[PDB]
Amino acid sequence: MIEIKDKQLTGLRFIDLFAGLGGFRLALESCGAECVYSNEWDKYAQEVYEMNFGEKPEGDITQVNEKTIPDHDILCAGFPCQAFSISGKQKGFEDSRGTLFFDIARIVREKKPKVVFMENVKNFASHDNGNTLEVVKNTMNELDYSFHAKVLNALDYGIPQKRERIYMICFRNDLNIQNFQFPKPFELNTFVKDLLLPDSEVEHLVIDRKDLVMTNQEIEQTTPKTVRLGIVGKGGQGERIYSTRGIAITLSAYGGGIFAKTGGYLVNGKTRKLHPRECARVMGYPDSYKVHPSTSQAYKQFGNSVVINVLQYIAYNIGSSLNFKPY
Numbered sequence: 001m002i003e004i005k006d007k008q009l010t011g012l013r014f015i016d017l018f019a020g021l022g023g024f025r026l027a028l029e030s031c032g033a034e035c036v037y038s039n040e041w042d043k044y045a046q047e048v049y050e051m052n053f054g055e056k057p058e059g060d061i062t063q064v065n066e067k068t069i070p071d072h073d074i075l076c077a078g079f080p081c082q083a084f085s086i087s088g089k090q091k092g093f094e095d096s097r098g099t100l101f102f103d104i105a106r107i108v109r110e111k112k113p114k115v116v117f118m119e120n121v122k123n124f125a126s127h128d129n130g131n132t133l134e135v136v137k138n139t140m141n142e143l144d145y146s147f148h149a150k151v152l153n154a155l156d157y158g159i160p161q162k163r164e165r166i167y168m169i170c171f172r173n174d175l176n177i178q179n180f181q182f183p184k185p186f187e188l189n190t191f192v193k194d195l196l197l198p199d200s201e202v203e204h205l206v207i208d209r210k211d212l213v214m215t216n217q218e219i220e221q222t223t224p225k226t227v228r229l230g231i232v233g234k235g236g237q238g239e240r241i242y243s244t245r246g247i248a249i250t251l252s253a254y255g256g257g258i259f260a261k262t263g264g265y266l267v268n269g270k271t272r273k274l275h276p277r278e279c280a281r282v283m284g285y286p287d288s289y290k291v292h293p294s295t296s297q298a299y300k301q302f303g304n305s306v307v308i309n310v311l312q313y314i315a316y317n318i319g320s321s322l323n324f325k326p327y
């Protein structure tokens with residue numbers, strides 16, 4: 001993550017829904033905001049969340065009563081995508097019933113807040129011929145909110161990894177805000193080689209394979225692209241080797257293969273996976289964020305997580321718009 005010297009959010013209060021590892025929390029707390037709530041049911045996530053943020057989030061959202069949630073200015077949420085079974089006249093609020101989204105709407109209609117800050121998968125914009133996005137959109141509009149959405153790729157913001165994700169920002173219509181804008185992309189000057197740990201701490205991740213077939217040889221120059229160097233097995237997912245002088249492929253929580261979630265990399269004449277500190281680093285997490293003792297957990301977590309840096313630029317630009325109220 002990077003440091004923000006202009007705390008455009010001091011004094012503002014927020015809730016961290018579907019917490020996971022606490023990305024949105026790391027991000028907003030650096031802009032000055034304060035955390036008033038958190039919710040997350042996966043006992044392992046709650047375990048890491050507590051190791052860093054000292055507290056344990058509450059449980060199953062489906063069961064928390066709306067009128068029970070603290071007063072807040074910003075609602076943060078990276079919920080899980082699910083299809084909507086639209087069975088009726090046109091689209092809106094009533095169709096979000098049965099999904100965990102309805103739980104967001106349920107809390108927004110009855111408690112504050114100035115802005116709803118969400119995030120999801122790269123293809124949220126296309127799911128069901130656009131139907132999935134059409135619903136969340138019409139729902140926010142009909143509760144008196146404005147809707148802005150965009151797909152930003154993390155390599156365009158100082159992080160070496162291919163990872164497109166839709167970011168969605170909603171401003172209460174009461175605020176009258178025609179002033180918002182998503183950050184501008186820039187030059188990348190950090191690649192996978194700069195994020196690795198020394199060999200001594202990564203020996204146990206080397207995988208020796210005789211069916212390794214090299215298609216290209218190591219490039220001499222770094223590029224902001226994904227460079228496939230070789231293969232193993234059938235060359236399907238999880239069995240492809242990448243160059244450290246490039247960008248990391250998209251980390252995944254539930255993938256399989258020989259090099260399962262991190263992908264495999266040619267580091268120093270040996271083929272290995274990424275270590276969890278590396279995974280953290282590839283997501284933007286600071287070296288001070290204590291990770292889960294179980295390396296198979298760290299993987300599932302960091303792959304369902306958030307790119308901190310991107311969250312920090314978008315949040316700053318939110319303090320801005322809310323702080324510009326001239327006579």
Ligand SMILES: C[S@@+](CC[C@H](N)C(=O)[O-])C[C@H]1O[C@@H](n2cnc3c(N)ncnc32)[C@H](O)[C@@H]1O
Pocket residue numbers: 017018019020040041042060061062063078079080081098099100
């Ligand atoms: C309250 S239960 C889901 C109940 C759902 N109504 C039902 O029909 O099955 C809470 C859900 O939150 C999901 N969840 C927790 N943290 C999340 C996050 N950061 N992003 C996405 N989904 C998350 C859990 O995996 C679980 O499915």
